[PDB]
């Protein structure tokens with residue numbers, strides 16, 4: 001017997017978000033942008049086991065990069081058998097540098113979040129038995145187990161957020177704000193409440209691939225094995241939208257280029273400032289709660305405002321970037337804010353930008 005499809009409860013902006021973040025085209029586009037062979041690795045055939053074997057192949061590579069073992073070519077060949085790549089049916093390149101090794105680790109981290117979105121969408125057994133089903137976009141929204149509320153022009157934080165975006169985004173081609181959603185991923189709450197005595201909270205940008213937005217909404221921002229960067233194995237944020245916007249992988253839709261950026265409330269506590277790269281960091285030093293790789297510039301601190309979120313004051317920058325003479329010789333043009341516990345960040349807002 002035919003099941004009834006119930007009417008969609010979502011507003012238009014939210015329907016479009018949910019369509020974009022679960023789009024098979026979007027996922028396959030992302031895979032093509034990462035040089036993956038989507039014909040040999042279709043979305044539905046992606047598996048946790050395959051991804052795990054990929055990381056094992058890169059771990060073997062890493063060890064070889066640091067005795068009569070297998071050549072980098074032989075070990076690369078093994079990786080590429082596990083994770084098929086496409087380079088116009090030429091040979092794929094040997095993974096023979098720290099930079100390329102990490103680029104492959106980053107590709108697998110994105111692919112793991114694509115696989116997470118696919119597994120999330122699997123039809124449960126209850127759903128096969130119930131006689132009415134939600135509209136597909138309500139179903140997909142519900143799988144996130146994450147409350148999203150579209151804001152309008154006169155939500156109390158709307159102009160504050162807009163100002164943060166405009167004042168710290170690129171001067172010439174600033175991203176155009178389309179929508180803001182407030183994000184409440186429940187049961188971030190409990191772990192985040194742990195740090196309630198920790199002051200020094202700031203609302204910070206996290207730009208991302210469209211392909212990992214569903215994963216982030218479901219699971220929060222995470223520190224994954226194999227993740228890394230100029231400040232080590234943590235979660236990375238920026239006070240300058242323009243820094244985070246560089247990590248936005250958008251998608252062409254009609255005449256526009258659509259992307260997503262998060263704002264997270266980050267309990268930074270006592271900050272350790274650095275001015276040179278340290279990719280080997282796994283934690284702040286003792287008695288510190290965060291590491292800030294300090295940039296040549298910072299949003300003018302004299303213009304900081306605050307929002308009140310769950311009864312805590314959260315600093316929100318509102319100033320254009322100004323020079324910080326004390327970090328004029330830093331290896332970082334713009335600051336990178338690092339935490340090394342997933343509990344120190346709570347997702348607060350999601351922005352669609354064109």
Ligand SMILES: C[C@H](NC(=O)CCc1nc2ccccc2c(=O)[nH]1)c1ccncc1
Pocket residue numbers: 106107109110113205206207208209212224227229236237238243244245247335336337
């Ligand atoms: C490989 C990919 N990387 C990113 O999403 C990086 C995002 C990002 N990095 C930053 C680094 C410094 C300052 C700001 C940012 C930022 O806003 N986003 C990824 C990492 C971990 N899980 C899934 C995907």
